[PDB]
Coordinates of C-alpha atoms and ligand atoms in Angstrom, one line a residue:
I4 CA 145.8 -63.8 0.6
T5 CA 146.6 -64.7 -3.1
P6 CA 149.1 -62.7 -5.0
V7 CA 147.7 -61.0 -8.1
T8 CA 149.9 -62.0 -11.1
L9 CA 149.5 -61.7 -14.9
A10 CA 147.8 -65.1 -14.8
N11 CA 145.4 -64.1 -12.0
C12 CA 144.6 -60.6 -13.1
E13 CA 141.7 -61.5 -15.4
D14 CA 139.8 -62.7 -12.3
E15 CA 140.8 -60.1 -9.7
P16 CA 138.1 -59.0 -7.3
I17 CA 138.8 -55.3 -7.6
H18 CA 135.4 -54.3 -6.1
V19 CA 136.2 -55.8 -2.7
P20 CA 139.7 -54.7 -2.0
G21 CA 138.9 -53.8 1.6
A22 CA 141.1 -50.8 1.4
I23 CA 140.7 -47.2 0.3
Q24 CA 142.7 -44.3 -1.2
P25 CA 144.3 -42.0 1.4
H26 CA 142.7 -38.7 0.3
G27 CA 139.7 -39.5 2.4
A28 CA 138.3 -41.6 5.2
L29 CA 135.5 -44.2 5.1
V30 CA 133.0 -45.4 7.6
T31 CA 130.7 -48.4 6.9
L32 CA 127.4 -48.7 8.7
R33 CA 124.7 -51.4 8.7
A34 CA 120.9 -51.0 8.2
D35 CA 120.2 -49.8 11.8
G36 CA 123.0 -47.3 11.5
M37 CA 125.4 -49.3 13.7
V38 CA 129.1 -49.0 12.7
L39 CA 130.5 -52.2 11.0
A40 CA 134.0 -51.0 9.9
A41 CA 136.2 -48.0 9.1
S42 CA 139.3 -47.1 7.2
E43 CA 142.3 -47.1 9.5
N44 CA 142.7 -43.3 9.1
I45 CA 139.3 -42.1 10.4
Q46 CA 141.0 -40.9 13.6
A47 CA 143.9 -39.2 11.9
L48 CA 141.6 -37.4 9.5
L49 CA 138.4 -36.9 11.5
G50 CA 139.1 -36.2 15.2
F51 CA 137.4 -39.4 16.4
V52 CA 137.8 -43.2 16.6
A53 CA 134.8 -44.9 14.9
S54 CA 134.4 -48.3 16.5
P55 CA 132.3 -51.4 15.4
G56 CA 129.3 -51.8 17.6
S57 CA 129.2 -48.1 18.1
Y58 CA 126.7 -45.6 16.8
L59 CA 127.8 -42.3 15.3
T60 CA 127.3 -39.3 17.6
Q61 CA 126.7 -35.6 17.1
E62 CA 129.9 -33.5 16.8
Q63 CA 132.0 -36.5 16.6
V64 CA 130.5 -36.2 13.1
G65 CA 128.1 -33.2 13.5
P66 CA 124.3 -32.9 13.1
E67 CA 123.5 -32.4 9.4
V68 CA 125.5 -35.6 8.8
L69 CA 123.4 -37.8 11.0
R70 CA 120.4 -35.8 9.6
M71 CA 121.4 -37.0 6.1
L72 CA 122.2 -40.5 7.3
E73 CA 118.8 -41.0 9.0
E74 CA 117.0 -40.1 5.8
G75 CA 118.9 -42.8 3.8
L76 CA 118.7 -45.2 6.7
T77 CA 114.9 -45.2 6.5
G78 CA 114.6 -45.2 2.7
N79 CA 114.1 -48.2 0.5
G80 CA 116.2 -48.4 -2.6
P81 CA 119.8 -47.3 -3.1
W82 CA 120.0 -44.1 -1.1
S83 CA 122.6 -41.5 -2.4
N84 CA 123.4 -38.1 -1.0
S85 CA 126.1 -35.7 0.1
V86 CA 126.5 -33.0 2.7
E87 CA 129.0 -30.3 3.4
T88 CA 129.9 -29.9 7.0
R89 CA 132.6 -28.8 9.5
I90 CA 134.2 -31.5 11.7
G91 CA 136.7 -30.0 14.0
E92 CA 139.4 -28.0 12.2
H93 CA 138.2 -28.5 8.6
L94 CA 135.1 -28.5 6.5
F95 CA 134.4 -31.7 4.7
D96 CA 132.5 -33.3 1.8
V97 CA 130.5 -36.1 3.3
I98 CA 129.4 -38.1 0.3
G99 CA 127.3 -41.1 1.4
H100 CA 125.6 -44.0 -0.3
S101 CA 124.1 -47.4 0.3
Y102 CA 125.0 -50.5 -1.8
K103 CA 123.8 -54.0 -0.9
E104 CA 122.4 -53.3 2.5
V105 CA 125.5 -51.7 3.9
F106 CA 125.6 -47.9 4.2
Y107 CA 128.8 -46.0 3.4
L108 CA 130.0 -42.5 4.5
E109 CA 133.0 -41.0 2.7
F110 CA 135.0 -38.0 4.0
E111 CA 137.1 -35.8 1.9
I112 CA 138.8 -32.6 3.1
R113 CA 137.3 -29.5 1.3
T114 CA 139.7 -26.8 0.6
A115 CA 137.6 -24.9 -2.0
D116 CA 136.6 -21.3 -1.2
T117 CA 133.6 -21.5 -3.5
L118 CA 130.0 -22.3 -2.8
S119 CA 129.3 -25.9 -3.9
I120 CA 126.1 -25.3 -5.8
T121 CA 127.6 -22.6 -8.0
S122 CA 130.9 -24.5 -8.5
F123 CA 128.7 -27.5 -9.6
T124 CA 126.5 -25.4 -11.9
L125 CA 129.4 -23.4 -13.4
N126 CA 131.3 -26.4 -14.6
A127 CA 128.3 -28.3 -15.8
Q128 CA 127.3 -25.4 -18.2
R129 CA 130.9 -25.2 -19.4
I130 CA 131.4 -28.9 -20.2
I131 CA 128.1 -29.7 -21.8
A132 CA 128.1 -26.7 -24.1
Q133 CA 130.6 -28.9 -25.9
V134 CA 127.8 -31.3 -26.6
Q135 CA 125.5 -28.8 -28.3
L136 CA 128.1 -27.6 -30.8
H137 CA 128.9 -30.7 -32.8
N138 CA 127.2 -32.9 -35.3
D139 CA 130.2 -35.1 -36.1
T140 CA 130.3 -37.8 -33.5
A141 CA 134.1 -37.6 -33.7
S142 CA 134.2 -33.8 -33.3
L143 CA 132.3 -34.2 -30.1
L144 CA 134.9 -36.6 -28.7
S145 CA 137.8 -34.5 -30.1
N146 CA 136.4 -31.2 -28.7
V147 CA 135.5 -32.3 -25.2
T148 CA 138.9 -33.9 -24.9
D149 CA 140.5 -30.5 -25.6
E150 CA 138.0 -28.8 -23.2
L151 CA 138.4 -31.3 -20.3
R152 CA 142.1 -30.4 -20.3
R153 CA 141.4 -26.7 -20.4
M154 CA 139.1 -27.1 -17.4
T155 CA 141.0 -29.5 -15.2
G156 CA 144.6 -28.7 -16.0
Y157 CA 145.4 -32.4 -16.5
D158 CA 148.7 -33.1 -18.4
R159 CA 147.0 -35.5 -20.7
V160 CA 143.4 -36.3 -21.5
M161 CA 142.4 -39.0 -24.0
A162 CA 139.2 -40.3 -25.6
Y163 CA 138.8 -44.0 -26.0
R164 CA 136.4 -45.7 -28.4
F165 CA 135.6 -49.3 -27.7
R166 CA 135.2 -51.7 -30.6
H167 CA 132.8 -54.7 -30.9
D168 CA 135.3 -57.0 -29.3
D169 CA 135.8 -54.4 -26.5
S170 CA 139.3 -53.5 -27.8
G171 CA 140.1 -49.8 -27.4
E172 CA 141.3 -47.1 -29.7
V173 CA 142.7 -43.7 -28.7
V174 CA 140.6 -41.5 -31.0
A175 CA 141.5 -38.1 -29.5
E176 CA 144.1 -36.4 -27.5
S177 CA 145.1 -33.2 -25.8
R178 CA 148.5 -33.3 -24.0
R179 CA 151.3 -31.1 -22.7
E180 CA 154.1 -30.7 -25.3
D181 CA 156.8 -32.8 -23.6
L182 CA 154.7 -36.0 -23.7
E183 CA 154.8 -38.7 -26.3
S184 CA 151.5 -39.2 -28.1
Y185 CA 149.3 -42.3 -27.9
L186 CA 147.0 -41.1 -30.8
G187 CA 145.8 -44.2 -32.6
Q188 CA 146.9 -46.6 -29.9
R189 CA 144.7 -49.5 -30.1
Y190 CA 144.4 -51.8 -27.1
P191 CA 142.5 -55.1 -26.5
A192 CA 139.5 -55.8 -24.4
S193 CA 141.7 -57.5 -21.8
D194 CA 143.4 -54.1 -21.0
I195 CA 140.3 -53.6 -19.0
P196 CA 139.1 -56.9 -17.5
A197 CA 135.5 -57.8 -16.7
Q198 CA 135.2 -56.3 -13.2
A199 CA 137.0 -53.0 -14.1
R200 CA 134.7 -52.7 -17.2
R201 CA 131.6 -53.5 -15.1
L202 CA 132.7 -50.7 -12.8
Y203 CA 133.2 -48.0 -15.4
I204 CA 129.7 -48.7 -16.6
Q205 CA 128.2 -48.5 -13.1
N206 CA 130.4 -45.5 -12.2
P207 CA 130.6 -42.3 -14.4
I208 CA 133.7 -41.1 -12.5
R209 CA 136.8 -42.9 -11.2
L210 CA 139.5 -40.9 -9.5
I211 CA 143.0 -41.9 -8.6
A212 CA 144.6 -39.1 -6.6
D213 CA 148.0 -40.7 -6.4
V214 CA 149.2 -43.9 -8.0
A215 CA 152.2 -44.2 -5.7
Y216 CA 149.9 -44.2 -2.6
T217 CA 150.0 -46.6 0.3
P218 CA 146.4 -47.9 0.7
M219 CA 144.4 -47.2 3.9
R220 CA 142.9 -50.5 5.0
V221 CA 139.4 -50.8 6.3
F222 CA 139.1 -52.8 9.5
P223 CA 137.7 -55.3 9.8
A224 CA 138.2 -57.0 6.5
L225 CA 135.1 -59.0 6.6
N226 CA 131.5 -57.8 7.3
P227 CA 130.5 -59.8 10.5
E228 CA 127.0 -60.0 9.1
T229 CA 128.1 -62.1 6.1
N230 CA 131.6 -63.2 6.8
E231 CA 132.3 -61.9 3.3
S232 CA 134.1 -58.8 2.1
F233 CA 132.6 -55.3 1.7
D234 CA 131.4 -54.5 -1.8
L235 CA 132.9 -51.0 -2.4
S236 CA 131.5 -50.9 -6.0
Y237 CA 129.9 -47.5 -5.6
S238 CA 132.6 -46.2 -3.3
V239 CA 134.5 -43.1 -4.6
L240 CA 137.6 -43.9 -2.4
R241 CA 137.9 -47.6 -3.3
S242 CA 141.6 -48.6 -3.8
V243 CA 143.4 -49.6 -7.0
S244 CA 144.7 -52.9 -8.4
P245 CA 148.5 -53.1 -8.0
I246 CA 148.6 -54.3 -11.6
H247 CA 147.0 -51.0 -13.0
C248 CA 149.2 -49.1 -10.6
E249 CA 152.3 -50.7 -12.0
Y250 CA 151.0 -50.0 -15.5
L251 CA 150.5 -46.3 -14.8
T252 CA 153.9 -45.9 -13.1
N253 CA 155.6 -47.7 -16.1
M254 CA 154.0 -44.9 -18.1
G255 CA 155.1 -42.3 -15.5
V256 CA 151.6 -41.3 -14.5
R257 CA 150.7 -40.4 -11.0
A258 CA 147.1 -39.4 -11.1
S259 CA 144.1 -40.5 -13.1
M260 CA 140.5 -39.6 -13.6
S261 CA 138.1 -41.2 -16.1
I262 CA 134.6 -40.2 -17.3
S263 CA 132.5 -43.0 -18.8
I264 CA 130.4 -43.0 -21.9
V265 CA 127.7 -45.7 -21.7
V266 CA 125.2 -46.5 -24.4
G267 CA 123.1 -49.6 -24.4
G268 CA 124.6 -51.9 -21.9
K269 CA 128.0 -51.2 -23.4
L270 CA 131.0 -49.2 -22.2
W271 CA 131.1 -47.2 -25.5
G272 CA 134.4 -45.5 -24.4
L273 CA 135.7 -43.2 -21.8
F274 CA 137.7 -40.0 -21.3
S275 CA 140.9 -40.8 -19.4
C276 CA 142.7 -37.9 -17.7
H277 CA 146.3 -38.5 -16.7
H278 CA 148.6 -36.3 -14.6
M279 CA 152.4 -36.7 -14.2
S280 CA 152.2 -35.4 -10.5
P281 CA 149.4 -36.3 -8.1
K282 CA 146.2 -34.4 -8.5
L283 CA 142.7 -34.0 -6.9
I284 CA 139.3 -33.0 -8.2
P285 CA 136.8 -31.6 -5.7
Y286 CA 133.5 -33.3 -5.2
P287 CA 131.2 -30.7 -6.6
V288 CA 133.3 -30.6 -9.8
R289 CA 133.3 -34.4 -10.1
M290 CA 129.5 -34.1 -10.0
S291 CA 129.6 -31.7 -12.9
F292 CA 131.4 -34.4 -14.9
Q293 CA 129.0 -37.1 -13.5
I294 CA 126.0 -35.3 -15.0
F295 CA 127.9 -34.5 -18.1
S296 CA 128.7 -38.2 -18.5
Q297 CA 125.0 -38.9 -18.6
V298 CA 124.2 -36.2 -21.2
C299 CA 127.2 -36.9 -23.4
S300 CA 126.3 -40.6 -23.4
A301 CA 122.9 -39.6 -24.6
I302 CA 124.2 -37.3 -27.4
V303 CA 126.8 -39.7 -28.6
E304 CA 124.0 -42.3 -28.8
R305 CA 121.9 -40.1 -31.1
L306 CA 124.9 -38.9 -33.1
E307 CA 125.8 -42.5 -33.8
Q308 CA 122.3 -43.4 -34.9
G309 CA 122.2 -40.2 -37.0
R310 CA 125.4 -41.6 -38.6
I311 CA 123.8 -44.9 -39.5
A312 CA 120.7 -43.1 -40.7
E313 CA 122.7 -41.3 -43.4
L314 CA 124.5 -44.5 -44.3
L315 CA 121.1 -46.1 -45.0
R316 CA 119.9 -43.1 -46.9
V317 CA 122.8 -42.9 -49.4
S318 CA 122.6 -46.7 -49.7
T319 CA 119.0 -46.6 -50.8
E320 CA 119.8 -43.6 -53.1
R321 CA 122.3 -46.0 -54.7
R322 CA 119.8 -48.8 -54.8
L323 CA 117.6 -46.4 -56.6
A324 CA 120.4 -45.4 -59.0
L325 CA 121.0 -49.2 -59.4
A326 CA 117.4 -50.0 -60.0
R327 CA 117.2 -47.2 -62.5
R328 CA 120.2 -48.3 -64.6
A329 CA 119.5 -52.1 -64.4
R330 CA 116.1 -52.0 -66.1
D331 CA 117.1 -49.5 -68.8
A332 CA 120.5 -51.0 -69.6
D333 CA 119.4 -54.6 -69.1
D334 CA 122.8 -55.9 -68.0
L335 CA 123.1 -56.0 -64.3
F336 CA 126.9 -56.4 -64.4
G337 CA 127.4 -52.9 -65.8
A338 CA 125.2 -51.4 -63.2
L339 CA 126.7 -53.4 -60.2
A340 CA 130.3 -52.7 -61.4
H341 CA 129.7 -49.0 -61.8
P342 CA 132.7 -47.2 -60.3
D343 CA 130.9 -45.0 -57.8
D344 CA 127.4 -46.3 -57.1
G345 CA 128.7 -49.8 -57.7
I346 CA 128.4 -52.5 -55.1
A347 CA 132.1 -51.9 -54.2
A348 CA 130.8 -48.5 -53.0
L349 CA 127.7 -49.9 -51.3
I350 CA 129.5 -51.4 -48.3
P351 CA 133.1 -50.6 -47.2
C352 CA 135.2 -53.3 -48.7
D353 CA 138.6 -54.0 -50.3
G354 CA 136.9 -55.8 -53.2
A355 CA 133.7 -57.2 -54.6
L356 CA 132.4 -60.0 -56.9
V357 CA 129.3 -60.3 -59.0
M358 CA 128.2 -63.7 -60.2
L359 CA 125.1 -64.7 -62.2
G360 CA 124.8 -67.4 -64.7
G361 CA 128.3 -68.6 -65.3
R362 CA 129.9 -65.2 -65.6
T363 CA 132.1 -63.7 -62.9
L364 CA 133.0 -60.0 -62.4
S365 CA 135.8 -59.4 -59.9
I366 CA 136.0 -55.7 -59.2
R367 CA 139.2 -54.4 -57.6
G368 CA 141.1 -57.7 -57.7
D369 CA 141.3 -61.4 -58.4
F370 CA 138.6 -62.9 -56.1
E371 CA 137.3 -65.7 -58.3
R372 CA 139.2 -68.4 -56.5
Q373 CA 138.0 -67.3 -53.0
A374 CA 134.3 -67.0 -54.1
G375 CA 134.7 -70.5 -55.5
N376 CA 135.9 -71.8 -52.2
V377 CA 133.4 -69.9 -50.1
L378 CA 130.7 -71.2 -52.4
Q379 CA 132.0 -74.7 -51.9
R380 CA 131.9 -74.3 -48.2
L381 CA 128.2 -73.4 -48.5
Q382 CA 127.7 -76.6 -50.3
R383 CA 126.8 -78.3 -47.0
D384 CA 124.4 -75.4 -46.2
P385 CA 122.0 -75.1 -49.2
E386 CA 119.5 -72.9 -47.2
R387 CA 121.9 -70.1 -46.4
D388 CA 121.0 -66.9 -48.4
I389 CA 123.5 -64.9 -46.4
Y390 CA 127.1 -65.7 -45.3
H391 CA 129.7 -63.7 -43.5
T392 CA 132.8 -64.1 -41.5
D393 CA 136.0 -62.2 -40.5
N394 CA 138.0 -65.4 -40.2
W395 CA 139.2 -67.3 -43.3
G406 CA 141.7 -67.9 -50.0
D407 CA 143.6 -64.8 -49.0
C408 CA 141.0 -62.3 -47.8
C409 CA 139.9 -62.7 -44.1
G410 CA 136.6 -61.0 -44.4
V411 CA 133.7 -62.2 -46.5
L412 CA 130.1 -61.2 -46.9
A413 CA 128.1 -63.1 -49.5
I414 CA 124.4 -63.0 -50.4
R415 CA 122.4 -65.1 -52.8
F416 CA 119.8 -63.4 -55.0
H417 CA 119.2 -66.1 -57.6
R418 CA 119.3 -69.8 -56.7
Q419 CA 119.0 -71.7 -60.0
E420 CA 121.5 -69.5 -61.9
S421 CA 123.7 -68.9 -58.8
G422 CA 123.3 -65.2 -58.6
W423 CA 125.8 -64.3 -55.8
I424 CA 127.3 -61.1 -54.5
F425 CA 130.5 -61.0 -52.4
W426 CA 132.3 -58.3 -50.6
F427 CA 135.8 -58.9 -49.3
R428 CA 138.0 -57.3 -46.6
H429 CA 141.7 -57.8 -45.9
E430 CA 143.2 -58.2 -42.5
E431 CA 142.7 -55.3 -40.1
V432 CA 145.7 -53.0 -40.1
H433 CA 147.0 -50.6 -37.4
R434 CA 145.7 -47.4 -39.1
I435 CA 148.0 -44.9 -37.4
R436 CA 151.5 -45.9 -36.3
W437 CA 154.3 -44.0 -34.6
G438 CA 158.0 -44.5 -35.2
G439 CA 161.0 -42.4 -36.3
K440 CA 163.0 -41.7 -33.2
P441 CA 163.3 -44.2 -30.3
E442 CA 161.1 -42.7 -27.6
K443 CA 162.3 -42.6 -24.0
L444 CA 163.1 -45.6 -21.9
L445 CA 160.2 -46.6 -19.6
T446 CA 161.4 -47.9 -16.2
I447 CA 159.6 -51.3 -16.1
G448 CA 158.2 -52.9 -13.0
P449 CA 158.5 -56.6 -11.9
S450 CA 155.5 -57.9 -13.8
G451 CA 157.3 -57.3 -17.1
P452 CA 156.9 -55.3 -20.3
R453 CA 153.3 -56.6 -20.8
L454 CA 152.1 -53.7 -18.7
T455 CA 153.5 -51.1 -21.1
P456 CA 151.5 -49.5 -23.9
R457 CA 154.0 -51.2 -26.3
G458 CA 153.2 -54.5 -24.8
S459 CA 149.5 -53.8 -24.9
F460 CA 149.6 -53.0 -28.6
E461 CA 151.4 -56.3 -29.3
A462 CA 148.8 -58.1 -27.2
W463 CA 146.2 -56.5 -29.5
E464 CA 148.0 -57.6 -32.7
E465 CA 148.0 -61.2 -31.6
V466 CA 144.3 -60.9 -31.1
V467 CA 143.2 -59.3 -34.4
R468 CA 145.7 -60.7 -36.9
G469 CA 143.9 -63.3 -39.0
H470 CA 140.8 -61.1 -38.7
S471 CA 139.2 -58.5 -41.0
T472 CA 137.1 -55.7 -39.5
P473 CA 133.7 -57.1 -38.5
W474 CA 130.7 -56.4 -40.7
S475 CA 128.6 -53.5 -39.4
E476 CA 125.1 -54.0 -38.1
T477 CA 124.5 -51.5 -40.9
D478 CA 126.6 -53.3 -43.5
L479 CA 124.5 -56.4 -43.2
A480 CA 121.3 -54.4 -43.3
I481 CA 122.4 -52.9 -46.6
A482 CA 123.4 -56.3 -48.1
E483 CA 120.0 -57.6 -47.1
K484 CA 118.2 -54.7 -48.9
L485 CA 120.4 -55.2 -52.0
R486 CA 119.5 -58.9 -52.0
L487 CA 115.8 -58.1 -52.0
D488 CA 116.3 -55.7 -54.9
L489 CA 118.0 -58.2 -57.1
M490 CA 115.5 -61.0 -56.3
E491 CA 112.8 -58.6 -57.4
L492 CA 114.7 -57.8 -60.6
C493 CA 115.5 -61.3 -61.6
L494 CA 112.0 -62.6 -61.0
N495 CA 110.3 -59.5 -62.5
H496 CA 112.0 -59.5 -65.9
Ligands
BLA1 C1 145.2 -58.5 -16.8 C2 144.2 -57.4 -17.0 C3 144.8 -56.1 -17.4 C4 145.8 -55.7 -18.4 C5 146.5 -56.7 -19.3 C6 145.9 -54.4 -18.4 O1 146.7 -53.8 -19.2 N1 145.1 -53.8 -17.5 C7 144.5 -54.8 -16.9 C8 143.5 -54.7 -15.8 C9 142.8 -53.3 -15.7 N2 143.0 -52.2 -16.5 C10 142.2 -51.2 -16.1 C11 142.0 -49.9 -16.6 C12 142.9 -49.4 -17.5 N3 143.4 -50.0 -18.6 C13 144.2 -49.1 -19.2 C14 145.1 -49.4 -20.6 C15 145.0 -48.5 -21.8 N4 144.0 -47.6 -22.1 C16 144.3 -47.0 -23.2 O2 143.6 -46.1 -23.8 C17 145.6 -47.4 -23.6 C18 146.3 -46.9 -24.8 C19 145.7 -45.9 -25.6 C20 146.0 -48.3 -22.7 C21 147.3 -49.1 -22.8 C22 144.2 -48.0 -18.5 C23 145.0 -46.7 -18.8 C24 143.4 -48.1 -17.4 C25 143.0 -47.1 -16.3 C26 141.5 -46.8 -16.3 C27 141.2 -45.4 -16.9 O3 141.9 -44.9 -17.7 O4 140.1 -44.9 -16.4 C28 141.5 -51.6 -15.0 C29 140.5 -50.8 -14.2 C30 141.3 -49.7 -13.5 C31 140.4 -49.1 -12.4 O5 140.0 -49.8 -11.5 O6 140.1 -47.8 -12.6 C32 141.9 -52.9 -14.8 C33 141.4 -53.8 -13.7

């Protein structure tokens, strides 16, 4: 019965809302096919009253439907299927699935004049051609963002990248003129709490037909079998958190639809479509996006590792240049401090320090004091050959490696505090009408929430950045020992 406030919202059970969106009806069955619960609108949408204890009957739901249901009813492992069928006055999409051991049948009115197979195929071809045309991982995102809008007619579609700390950044955008831009918006990991994030990962597509909707409750609330709520995780019609709804209306959005990009076990980022009036996307089309989601995820994965590959390649090429120079010139300092192949170019940094013997070369600033303090901190830890941190002198980020012990051969890279890369301003943008929860649920409030998180922090060191440092360290050890 608990109200969901700003304090609660982190722990909101959004998977068991026990209600569904109004653009469809829902019937929940148990293993034997016996009805356990239904949305309060089954009668109003489909001509009949589903009742707990009942079993579904032909042409109160039609034949092919039970035909489908029986197949999944007798199959081990998460059944999933859909049928198209006429029930009374209308034809329906009857998407059905089984999660836990409860079976779900979802009913959407089908208004499309097209054959489903071809509608599905047509859109799949169109939206994944965008995945064959681009080598830049950012062109991919940018282009499919522009294309998703062309296909769906959404007012605004955005592509979100998720950082290491699960904070988000709007990296692409295609929007109708009128609308303010959110390009470069960065948002925290909290803007999408655990359960919501778990769900985007498990579900390629989420659709919100109308944010201003009144939910259609499924009765009864609790599954008699367990005396605990129905887990609508894989339910297409599952209802929305009032918090998110308030957020979206603060923005002035009325319909959403998001396509996930999952790589590893991580939500790599999603495409968020936003409409200013309510909007619906037919089932077969959503399936076009679902399959797309899986392929795009695959290509983004490769494109990203193709990116790291090239980073490693030019790094070694520079380690080669470095090895070449060092042996022939015989001062390392000159080699390391080289303007372009120098260490400052090896790994993205705002500065670097080279330190062998008693001599100190600070390149791109005065870093001698910091390096001294960092080194003192490592006093307590004589065995550390590598040190790094984004919390901390005057530079937040530090990556230090040791290549000579006795003569204190050290290398440092430094990073300043992370800064909002792109920022809007210039003319006060319009007044958002703000709900009861407060300004926290506006983009402006989200951004501020993000600042408070990152400030005091430099950008984390790449998986890649550390790998390079490690290779460099090996190089110099080799050199110093060798000659
Ligand atoms: C207390 C937890 C939450 C805060 C704070 C908050 O802002 N939202 C919170 C809970 C959820 N958010 C969910 C999804 C979600 N989050 C945002 C916020 C942004 N995304 C952006 O890209 C930007 C700016 C560029 C912002 C400000 C949005 C738009 C959404 C909608 C999901 C989508 O776009 O697909 C969320 C899950 C929602 C769901 O159930 O679909 C929760 C629970």
